[PDB]
Design a protein around this ligand. Sequence first.
Ligand code: CLA
Ligand code: CLA
Ligand code: CLA
Ligand code: CLA
Ligand SMILES: CC1=C(/C=C/C(C)=C/C=C/C(C)=C/C=C/C=C(C)/C=C/C=C(C)/C=C/C2=C(C)CCCC2(C)C)C(C)(C)CCC1
Ligand SMILES: CC1=C(/C=C/C(C)=C/C=C/C(C)=C/C=C/C=C(C)/C=C/C=C(C)/C=C/C2=C(C)CCCC2(C)C)C(C)(C)CCC1
Ligand SMILES: CC1=C(C/C=C(\C)CCC[C@H](C)CCC[C@H](C)CCCC(C)C)C(=O)c2ccccc2C1=O
Ligand code: SF4
Ligand code: SF4
Lengths: 80, 70, 220, 154, 143, 741
Amino acid sequence: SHSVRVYDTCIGCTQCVRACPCDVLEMVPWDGCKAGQIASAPRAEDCIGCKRCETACPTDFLSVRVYLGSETTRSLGLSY
Amino acid sequence: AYSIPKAFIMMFCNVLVISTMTIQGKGLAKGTPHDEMVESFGITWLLAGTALGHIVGAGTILGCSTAGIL
Amino acid sequence: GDFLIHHAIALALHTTTLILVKGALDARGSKLMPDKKDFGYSFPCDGPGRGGTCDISAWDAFYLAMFWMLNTIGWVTFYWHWKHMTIWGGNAAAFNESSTYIMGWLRDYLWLNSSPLINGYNAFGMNAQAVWAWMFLFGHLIWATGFMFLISWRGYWQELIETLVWAHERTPIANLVKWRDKPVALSIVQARLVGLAHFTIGYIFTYAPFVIASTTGKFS
Amino acid sequence: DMVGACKPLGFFDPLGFSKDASPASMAKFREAELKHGRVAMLACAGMITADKFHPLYDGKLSSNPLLAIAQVPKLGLLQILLFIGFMEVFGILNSRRPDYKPGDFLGSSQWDTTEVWDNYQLRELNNGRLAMFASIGMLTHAYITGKGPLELLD
Amino acid sequence: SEFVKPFNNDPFVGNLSTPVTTSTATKLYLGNLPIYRKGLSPLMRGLEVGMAHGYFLIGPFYILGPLRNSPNALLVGLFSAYGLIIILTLALTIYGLASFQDNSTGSNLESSKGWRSFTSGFTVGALGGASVAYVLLNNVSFF
Amino acid sequence: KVRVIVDKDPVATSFEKWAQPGHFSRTLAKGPKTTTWIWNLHADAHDFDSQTSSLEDISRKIFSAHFGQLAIIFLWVSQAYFHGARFSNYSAWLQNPTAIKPSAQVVWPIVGQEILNGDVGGGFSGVQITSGVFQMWRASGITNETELYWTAMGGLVMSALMVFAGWFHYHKAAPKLEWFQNVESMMNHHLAGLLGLGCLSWSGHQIHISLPINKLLDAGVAPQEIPLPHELLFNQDLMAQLYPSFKKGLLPFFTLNWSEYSDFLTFKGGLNPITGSLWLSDTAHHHLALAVLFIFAGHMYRTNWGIGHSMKEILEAHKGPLTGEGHKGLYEILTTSWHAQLAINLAMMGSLSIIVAHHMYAMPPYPYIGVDYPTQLSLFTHHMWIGGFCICGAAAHGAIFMVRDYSPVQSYNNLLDRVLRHRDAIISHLNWVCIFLGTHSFGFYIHNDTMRALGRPQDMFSDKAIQLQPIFAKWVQSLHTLAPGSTAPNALATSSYAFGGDVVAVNGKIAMMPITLGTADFMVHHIHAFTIHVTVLILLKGVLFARSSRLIPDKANLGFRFPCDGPGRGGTCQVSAWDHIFLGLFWMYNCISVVIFHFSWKMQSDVWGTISSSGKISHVTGGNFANSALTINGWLRDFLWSQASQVIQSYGSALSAYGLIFLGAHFIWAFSLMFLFSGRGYWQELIESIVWAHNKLKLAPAIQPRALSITQGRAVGLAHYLLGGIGTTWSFFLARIISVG
Ligand code: CLA
Ligand code: CLA
Ligand code: CLA
Ligand code: CLA
Ligand SMILES: CC1=C(/C=C/C(C)=C/C=C/C(C)=C/C=C/C=C(C)/C=C/C=C(C)/C=C/C2=C(C)CCCC2(C)C)C(C)(C)CCC1
Ligand SMILES: CC1=C(/C=C/C(C)=C/C=C/C(C)=C/C=C/C=C(C)/C=C/C=C(C)/C=C/C2=C(C)CCCC2(C)C)C(C)(C)CCC1
Ligand SMILES: CC1=C(C/C=C(\C)CCC[C@H](C)CCC[C@H](C)CCCC(C)C)C(=O)c2ccccc2C1=O
Ligand code: SF4
Ligand code: SF4
């Protein structure tokens, strides 16, 4: 499965979770950001790797980042 | 028009078309009275009826002339 | 003609070096992707975000420079073969006069010297160069087949394979025979590799019959 | 009950048959009716087309229906018989099935059919009846005159 | 009057109950073919399939082969059919090896023993069918 | 009630939004920040549906845009007529059509390009034309240049009128959506009013001006002594001298003695022996019959009066057991969505252009056009290409409708829904058809090549080794040859001489000749079928999977054209219906290229040529198609290599322009492969390096440069590919045919 990571440059815009089509990402409380939340990836096994989170991320470089890795049925998104 | 057979054929075709035509489910052949057809459709009932009567009359007259029947 | 073709060779060498040097130096990272070293050498892309990130991995700079390698060596070998064919025929004036323009290159080298190859086999019979003619058209076919992989990309073929999977699973009799590995379209890098290999192999297998068969038929 | 009843004759059954007969007998009657109609339609179409358009066998087989089959080779007749026998053993298995609907190889009891289905079934039945009369007429004309249908019409 | 409905009353399965898929004729023909016939052992299924395929495999090679216009046309066609049947049963054996790796049930096409029996029946039936077709084509003057 | 309702002064006439470039688009109205803004401007220029949300405004914009297009077309017709009037040898060609080469373009002497003004005969130097306009005007009856000049001026006036109408119907009096949605009245007026009266007026023009002038010209009267059309129009005595039935007047029309006009309203068929083209009396009768047919057709649909049909009820009445609700909702779809109408109309327009190409070569309609071999090849190839392009536009706009204007509420359980619900079966079966057809058709060629290379001609799929005869095509040809006696008794000759009959020839050259079909024709026709089927596979898959697919359930959300959905799921590259169109354009290019190559080789080998007095028939290539079209080697040698001589050897002659365009088209085709194979990331990094170089000298632009978008790179590659290929074939065909014919 792919590896989803979130770096502390996040600004709690919750747009990665909205762009997420597989419920891989969720907001959790945090101290560093003023919004008091940070994206996290507790369900990376469901990740497919379309990087809509990366597309929607507005930071100068991506606070949320996806590294493609081992392929599975879920990651390949095969209905068969 | 020149020939009495041609006039007879055209008149018969026009009358047949006017009798057997149907507009929006109303027609003389379908037991709609003449007065009701006149009120519902007006002179559009005669204009379309005689136009198609002339078309079918031309078709039958030209066919009969080709076949030598006339 | 030698002046012009040498400057063309310089163009091709400098462009190939440009592509390869840029790939090598931007392999670690770039302004569009400063963390490329984390992804590695050969990865498909970074997605459509940031305007699109096709062919960014610096393996794709090998892929793209292989085309220029084939181009430059093709120009070099065309130059050598024509300048030597004319001199072997004692007709160097033809090269000195016609090599100064591309129509002369297309007419007096390819079209003129392609006759003994394509006439390896015809309707009236066949010669010992029939094998070379077959191969010229076979290299043509492989080169053309590479264009499919190079132009058409993965999503179309993945959807098509999904339809074929549906058909195989739903047909009777044949559905008793069932795969073990789920069929999928070729990966992005895989298909780039396959298309490049088809391009290169068609290139060599369609030029080798020409350079050998024309030289053999003319014997000069 | 069934679909055969039609406007010109209504429920045509002067000689009983329908009553005092088992449901199996009624199903057999309708299966035979549909088989006769279908075979007769095929025969009528074959005679009509083969009178004036017979490209097979180098166009040498006669237009007479009662002599073309005589001139057809033995292997062709054997293959036609084998095909018809295969269709008929499928019909026999359909008869043995527990949800048989006389003549219905399509199933048609497992879909939400409506009155249009019955109307189309009646269309099949009436065309089959017309072909049943017509094909026997064609064969009798061929025996009498020696000409086929369209040749006789000429 | 709908004629295309969900497959087995399941709208969310990727299929449709069309006349082609589900009609009584289709059900009868498919279920009575050897691969789906009831009570046939895997050997019998393989045997029937084998003779059916080996009977017709000879014909293409016999008529359209390189030695069609030769006195040994039929013999060459039979040898070609034998070679193709050898390749086919090798394909069957490797397919069984790859698919039915671990199995102890038997008497089922989806088991190692059952598939081996099916392949054996196919091989014997195909060889016999090709030989019978050779004999018939030699004695074609009968028909 | 069908009525006219418009809004008065809906838009002000001002240049403020000329100055503001991206006014139409919400996103582009802000201003440029990157060079992608410039590209997006042109990409979204005419996307009215994306620009606004009012169907009324979209319809008004479309209507006035159509007026602008009509103005451009009128200017184009004006250019044709005016150049014929002024810069052409039309008078010399009219005096001597067989010997004089038509030409209506002259190049100035600037850089030695005056060599292109070749010797075309008649004491005139210019560029030979291949549009057939000379034969068109000869058919129309134009015999002098004042007529060409005046019709050119009239065309200019019409173009100005169209520009004025386009301005008026958007800025002064724009119609309403209620006016636009009167499809029944529109169909009535276009059938009876546009097509019917157009055919009627053309038939009148023919009967009054074209039959007399053409008959006199064929008799031998030179154009100077021809009576003028205004004289012929009312001089019934001269018309009676020419066609005796004209002395009877219009009474034989009003009374149904239509047979009296048999002399100038004929059913002869075949080709006129003098001009080697269709009889103009037959053409006049044809157009008159069509006028009657269309005026009859145009009274079908309902309007303000009670009589008439309604397309809504006609569609809703057509539903069957295997289709559920049937055609319910399609009337609403086609009344609300412009893209569906565009799709249907483009498909029909393209197929009709292909039919025009197939008919014009087989039945040469204009005088001396059959012997004009460049004109026939040019018109056929042109219309085939236009047809393919229009068909792919049809597929693209069908996909656009599916993405944007589709909605299940209106299409619950109709034909569109039922088609979407088994698109998988449709595409899988077409996939099998494509594989089977391509395998067999191209494997015939590959088998033949292999056997020839192995020295086994007896094992080939040839006319004498293993015949694949087109029995059905031969049967249809036989029926069409026997038709004039049996099934078309009043027709004297065949509809076309391609099916069979005599060999029509004018002077030495052959206008038409029977086209015999054999094994090579079987193979190439099945190749055509395979190519058409694969193009349909790509386009139909793009249309059906526009909404979604097993790979992307929410493909409709992304849009119509989008680059991808990331590298997930193994890679979702080119999943868009736009990318399906991009792939299908390559395939129609392949299809039409093979079709035109087949046409060119078959006609030069088997129809075109010269016939001697003794009856010897000598063809351009010598009938080599039947034996050399069996192998790809023969296609490469006896067609491409053999006929490229006239192109490559063109330097220093009038066809040097064709040689230069040949090389340039090759260059552009090769250039396109850069865009087709490369990717945006490489070019963006290279642009970053170049931007650094510019920033070092303090000249990096405020509008930051960017690599082209992925969709744009694909579009640019496709456009350059198509331009290069079509230009290569254009130069090759024109040079070859002008040199040899
Ligand atoms: C042999 C073919 C055949 C068969 C098996 C049937 C069977 C049936 N028809 Mg009949 N039918 C037929 C031909 C046939 N039909 C033909 C050609 C017509 C057109 C006139 C009709 C018209 C018709 C109508 C209008 C109706 C039926 C109906 C029925 C059903 C009830 C009557 C019954 O039991 O008849 C039993 C029939 C037989 C046992 C066949 C043999 C009959 C005698 C013994 C010999 C043949 C008669 C006669 C000598 C003909 C040949 C001479 C000459 C013409 C050469 C039943 C399913 C009714 C129905 O379906 O209601 C629900 C119904 O409404 N049929
Ligand atoms: C696809 C196109 C094609 C076709 C039609 C043929 C045809 C032929 N080739 Mg081949 N050939 C091809 C491509 C093709 N070739 C290519 C691409 C090459 C280059 C490698 C060659 C190279 C080649 C050589 C070197 C030779 C041939 C030869 C032959 C002949 C015999 C081959 C043979 O034994 O087949 C055997 C075929 C079969 C056992 C089965 C074929 C498929 C069956 C009939 C399909 C039935 C489907 C059925 C309807 C499905 C539904 C059934 C259900 C309803 C019950 C034959 C004329 C030989 C010859 O003598 O030529 C004259 C020969 O020496 N070919
Ligand atoms: C009746 C004809 C017709 C109409 C009205 C439309 C209308 C439309 N199309 Mg188009 N389309 C057509 C035919 C038509 N199409 C055909 C034949 C095809 C098949 C190729 C397409 C394929 C197509 C696609 C795939 C798409 C559209 C789209 C669009 C929309 C935006 C177009 C735009 O703004 O372009 C403005 C104009 C330009 C950008 C300039 C284009 C320049 C071309 C590519 C090259 C011209 C080369 C020139 C002729 C020769 C150069 C020679 C050289 C030597 C210099 C618009 C609704 C787009 C959309 O989003 O639709 C909703 C879209 O994605 N169309
Ligand atoms: C010469 C170059 C080439 C070749 C060989 C192919 C081949 C194919 N393309 Mg195409 N394609 C090309 C260029 C080419 N393409 C280019 C440049 C593009 C980019 C625009 C595309 C884009 C494209 C798309 C988008 C699609 C295709 C499709 C197809 C397939 C069509 C179905 C078919 O007939 O398969 C049969 C195979 C052939 C015709 C190839 C030659 C066959 C010979 C005769 C041998 C066959 C016999 C045997 C099995 C093998 C030989 C023996 C061997 C064991 C040694 C096929 C695999 C379509 C597809 O997949 O449809 C199912 C499809 O969707 N192509
Ligand atoms: C259904 C159908 C169809 C199809 C058909 C088919 C598919 C057929 C086939 C057929 C065939 C394909 C047949 C076969 C046969 C076979 C046989 C008859 C065989 C035999 C064999 C034998 C007898 C053997 C023997 C042996 C053995 C076993 C072993 C050892 C050796 C020996 C020799 C002893 C069609 C299309 C028409 C249409 C309609 C329906
Ligand atoms: C009876 C008969 C027969 C048969 C026939 C048949 C079988 C037919 C079929 C037919 C058919 C089978 C038809 C079909 C048609 C179709 C159509 C007509 C369609 C249309 C479509 C459309 C119009 C579309 C549109 C669109 C697009 C394009 C895109 C988007 C969407 C939409 C929808 C908008 C025979 C031969 C024996 C002969 C005698 C008679
Ligand atoms: C070559 C190439 C480029 C480089 C092209 C770029 C950056 C755009 C080039 C457009 C030019 C500027 C158009 C005008 C060219 C004129 C000759 C320039 C002189 C005029 C100036 C005043 C602008 C891509 O960006 C690209 C992107 C995606 C897939 C393939 C490719 C691709 O193949
Ligand atoms: S920067 Fe990315 S991860 Fe952080 S809040 Fe914004 S969208 Fe979410
Ligand atoms: S289409 Fe291909 S190259 Fe482009 S972003 Fe998607 S995976 Fe990368």
